Design a protein around this ligand. Sequence first.
Ligand SMILES: Nc1nc2c(ncn2[C@H]2C[C@H](O)[C@@H](COP(=O)(O)OP(=O)(O)OP(=O)(O)O)O2)c(=O)[nH]1
Ligand SMILES: [Mg+2]
Lengths: 83, 105, 170, 141, 120, 344, 113, 97, 320
Amino acid sequence: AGRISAFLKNAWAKEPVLVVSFSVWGLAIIMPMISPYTKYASMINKATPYNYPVPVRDDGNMPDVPSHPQDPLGPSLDWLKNL
Amino acid sequence: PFLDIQKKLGISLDRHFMFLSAEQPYKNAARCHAFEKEWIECAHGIGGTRAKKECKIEFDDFEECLLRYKTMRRMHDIKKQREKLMKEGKYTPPPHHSGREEPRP
Amino acid sequence: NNYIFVLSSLFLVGCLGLALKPSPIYGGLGLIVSGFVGCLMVLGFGGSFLGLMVFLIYLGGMLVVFGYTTAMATEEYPETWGSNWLILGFLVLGVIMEVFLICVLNYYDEVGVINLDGLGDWLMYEVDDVGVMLEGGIGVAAMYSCATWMMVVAGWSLFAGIFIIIEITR
Amino acid sequence: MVKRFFESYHEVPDGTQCHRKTYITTALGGICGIIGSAYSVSLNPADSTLEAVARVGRYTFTAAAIGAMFGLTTCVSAQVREKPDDPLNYFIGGCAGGLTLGARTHSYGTAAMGCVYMGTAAALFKIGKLEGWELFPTPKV
Amino acid sequence: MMNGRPGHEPLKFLPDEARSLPPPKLNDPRLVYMGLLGYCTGLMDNMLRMRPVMRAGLHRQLLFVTSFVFAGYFYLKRQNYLYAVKDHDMFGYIKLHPEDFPEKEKKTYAEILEPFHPVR
Amino acid sequence: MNPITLAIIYFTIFLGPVITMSSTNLMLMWVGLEFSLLAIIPMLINKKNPRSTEAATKYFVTQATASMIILLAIVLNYKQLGTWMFQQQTNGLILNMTLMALSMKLGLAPFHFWLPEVTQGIPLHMGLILLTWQKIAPLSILIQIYPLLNSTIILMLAITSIFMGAWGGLNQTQMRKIMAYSSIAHMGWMLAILPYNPSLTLLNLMIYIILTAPMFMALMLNNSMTINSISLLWNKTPAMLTMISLMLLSLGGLPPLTGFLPKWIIITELMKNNCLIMATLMAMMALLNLFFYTRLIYSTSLTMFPTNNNSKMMTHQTKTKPNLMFSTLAIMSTMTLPLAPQLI
Amino acid sequence: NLYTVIFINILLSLTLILVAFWLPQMNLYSEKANPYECGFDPTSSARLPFSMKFFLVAITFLLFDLEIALLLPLPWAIQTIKTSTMMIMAFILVTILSLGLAYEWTQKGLEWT
Amino acid sequence: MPSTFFNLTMAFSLSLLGTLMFRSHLMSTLLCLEGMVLSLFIMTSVTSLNSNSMSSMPIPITILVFAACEAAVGLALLVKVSNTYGTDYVQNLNLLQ
Amino acid sequence: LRYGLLAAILGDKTTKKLHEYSRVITVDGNICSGKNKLAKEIAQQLGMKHYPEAGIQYSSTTTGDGRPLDIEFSGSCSLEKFYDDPKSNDGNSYRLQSWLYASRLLQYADALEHLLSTGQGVVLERSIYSDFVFLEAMYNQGYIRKQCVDHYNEIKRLTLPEYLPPHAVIYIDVPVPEVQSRIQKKGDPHEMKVTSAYLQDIENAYKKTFLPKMSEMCEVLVYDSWEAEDPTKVVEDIEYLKYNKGPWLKQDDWTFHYLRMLVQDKTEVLNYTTIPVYLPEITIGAHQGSRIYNSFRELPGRKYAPGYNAEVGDKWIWLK
Ligand SMILES: Nc1nc2c(ncn2[C@H]2C[C@H](O)[C@@H](COP(=O)(O)OP(=O)(O)OP(=O)(O)O)O2)c(=O)[nH]1
Ligand SMILES: [Mg+2]
């Protein structure tokens, strides 16, 4: 198991640019899989207001869709205003 | 298709930008989107030969919307009549069309 | 006010010179005059990305196309637009054919193609006034997310292009 | 207006309207000679543009000669026989056209070849227009 | 035609109605011809590869006969389904339009008058 | 040619017809046609002879300007309809642009002049992948738009391709050029049938592929370049002589072999579609395919030509260049006329 | 605005060419207008064919410029909602570009011929 | 708009006349081919801008990438032609007759 | 299995096989210049493979039965008949020379197959890069004609530059009276009958045409007869050569694999020397060729493909 380490240290001493490039490449490949903030990027891009989400009609049916904009119902943003 | 592998596997790979009335980034609708939607939903599985005599009114309205040929012809005779009436001197121009008025927002 | 028609007539003149085919060193100059004209046309139309993107990709391609003209396909006594007199007579013939075409095209059709005070008014069809995304950049940004097969096939075109060009130039 | 100008071949029968009958047959021969001379100049070029335009004039003179004398001989054969509904006037007009084509190119063997082949083709065109055959049919079945 | 027929499963080799068709037998002359084709495939391949054309390559001849009979039975089932569904679409269109495809009440030979053409 | 670029070039020439036959976006099968052009070019130049670069640049300039004409047709479809796929209510000028560009890439007779010269400068296993596999994809977009194709330009293209596939093979005595011309006559047949029944276009494409691909494998088997080089077959490999004779006369199209069946079913659907004298002219000018194939069959397997003294080592050495695919597509072509309704 | 700034830059540089040409005194002859190459007349014509030595690396400069124009919409594609397939598509095409340049680096055509 | 689109159609018909004839070089024909690349980009972007169909903005970068990649293939094809010949001209290529 | 691309990608690359003791040596001279003794000593001392001088009956003893076949099967030419009647009305000289050139083409193919298969070097006396000097000595003696020279130059232009040149070209030069003295001391009654002008013509043709053609591109070592009699100095000057200047130092492993694809099957090796050019010296007629094929297939061992002959004793013919 010393041959791979000797080749890695020899390339590190001689031409370290491809070693740094492949290490940063593998870090960029594996670091979204490690980091817990990968799932917050889709939350950011969903919870941004970007167009008008239009009001819907009601027959007294759904309780989750609010009437006042300052109601506690609906998808809140305490994970973005405080965090 | 010839090999209908997208319909076989059920996954759209080039099919979600096929016409003008496909889904758009950040929900911004194209021009003549309602005309294209009513043209496809009037040609909804009718067939090509029956649809070109059936929804010819909806295609003619959508083609008129998209290329605006009779609209530009109408504005062309309106502008030619404006040049003829300004050379005649009969048409006093309104100040709303001249632009010398306070505008509403 | 007649910006797109004046620029499109200049594009007709530049593609006419490229079509009348000089030494290709001079043809690169005429085609990049047409490229600056087309970049300014898309930037005057509302594509703030597409004209500068074709100026970047076209200046960068046409640089080494120009280098291949002045290396490989060169000639001791070349032909510009003013060198050969059949080319010069064809140039003034194409110029008088273009202005005779617009002089018969404002008169035959009786539609809104060319009018002396009614052209340029039918250029912008509809952009949303209160909307926020109307430039061309976010639609070509959507090929990463919606139209993913476009980026798959373009990356495979460039990968196969590298391998195909190594096999050609070997 | 070119196609409805060329449709004077069938709206009036042969044995009448002979001057413009010969004119539209010469115009069909001139169109075929212009495209054949353009094919011959673009395929096998001459050493000079004067020789190329002389080849163009010779080819369109040969094709205008066979078209003009084919239409004129089928018109005077309709004049002599006074029957419009036969293919034999087109047969003898095509044979006179092939004879004049072989007299232009100066070989009696291809004069006989042009006589029998364009007489067969002219009788086939007349027999198709008599029995209502379709040259370029729309797909119906 | 069959690409534009309604209810068509796209790129399906055998749909569920091909099971509702009767399947072809193994004694059928098209499969007999394809078994002869597989034996002739083995004979031609052994002749080109310079073999005894009967003695050598018996396993390759057996694979040729079996794969030819297999592909021919599956293609024969698909083509029988295609001609049966052509008959079904035609009979359905005939049942839909009797006023566009009327019954031809042919008159009898006593009633009609065929012209007599004597040769002598 | 390393195996990495060999695998990517073969996967791209597999991929281009696959995305062409799979996609319904008109620019996406333009993209597939561009993959076809791109992956064919280093295979054309990879022998590195001076004729191969000439054939490669002839192929590139013709197929690239046809790619630009069909891209004009796709962009004018975007102006006229706003969609991408060819629908029913479009102008005939754009469809004529499409048919002219696709006849340029397919090699029909007002555009055919690159195809014998392109086939002459290349080795035979590139003629295998250019003569059969390359012409699936422009034919497949032309199958996809079959109600929109205008029958006048389709039938004039068919008449000229039957006429010049008849009139290009008799003067010219090289094998790759003579089978480019016979292929030009065969796409004259499968462009004649195209707006009437595209299943018979697929049938004539499949019969022409299984009739030309083992014939190009038989040319590959001895590298038989000329008519005298295929006339040396009785001392090189005499065992293929009656099979290449049956394949030659079947590619000409005689009964009871399979090549009559495209002519028979094209005549069947053409007289169902009421086109009498023009299909008569097609089937009457089809006999010059048997003129160059009967001269070629008299060269290879009906007269034993003079051999030379150095062919006795071709009798001496063993040969492993026969493939199983040659024998199975050889007999699957040459005896399938009693299976012809299942072949429909 | 920007057209007027480009045209006043045209007018400024054209005014500088006019004051560079028309104001200085100038007599010109054939040895003065002889082209310079080290103090002698040139051996051949100066537009004689160069045999180009960076040809395959020149074509991959062109194709890499097509890749960076493919990669130019990615600062607005980072704002998209389907960020998993966006980052997978960006990962697979930068991996495609790095593997193509690694193939050219192993085949050693970066050196001239 | 129809004046601009008909003049772009005239520019394509002119560049069709340019690439459909040969004066002295294959490279000026390839410059006419790249003029067709630029004209189809300008036509596609003008069509997408006035129809406002911004979902089909993946199409003109695919036009540029595929057509300029085949243009680069033809540019190195002319490099291999001039390497195997030493000349470049259109009349040089009559050796396949 | 067989050397395909599928066998090549698993690690059958020739750069691991090739080392310093893997060279193509040709040993060259006039008639009876000690080349076979020097070739046997060179292959014995360096451990290389001694391929002998390929004659008219090389291919029959190389491929197939291994027995030398008859005078009309792998012949239609004889070296004894050429030495008896050189100006032949039957055209014996071109049939001998073209059959000998195709035989040494097969020898060069088998030597390149052996070297690129097992990595061991090979010797090749009077190779295809020096086989033109016998035809041009025949032409300068007037035994054949100008169109014969152009057809052999077309055959050599088809068959030479797809191959690789030899690494070392040993020439043993010897003067024409010593060639006549050794060809009298050998004692063959038909090879005694050759002219001295033919030997002088092949000697000065060798010294004026072949050696500037080969010394400018690959390594050529010259030696006298008394200097090349004792071979230890010859094999040490072969072993201590630098092998720098040559066309073997620019091809890669897949170029060597495509050379093995062009070399390994003989149906593309021997194809370009039987191209149809109808010169009447080498043209076998149709009845003579059909009679020689339908007597060739009735020979034992050559009726079918090898490994498939049930009349000889090739077993397992039932399932193969
Ligand atoms: N006409 C002709 N004769 C050839 C050719 N190649 C070889 N020979 C003849 C010349 C001699 O008769 C014989 C070659 O004899 P060698 O020079 O090898 O002499 P020998 O076998 O005594 O061996 P040695 O040289 O003493 O080691 O083959 C050829 O291309 N043409
Ligand atoms: Mg010796």
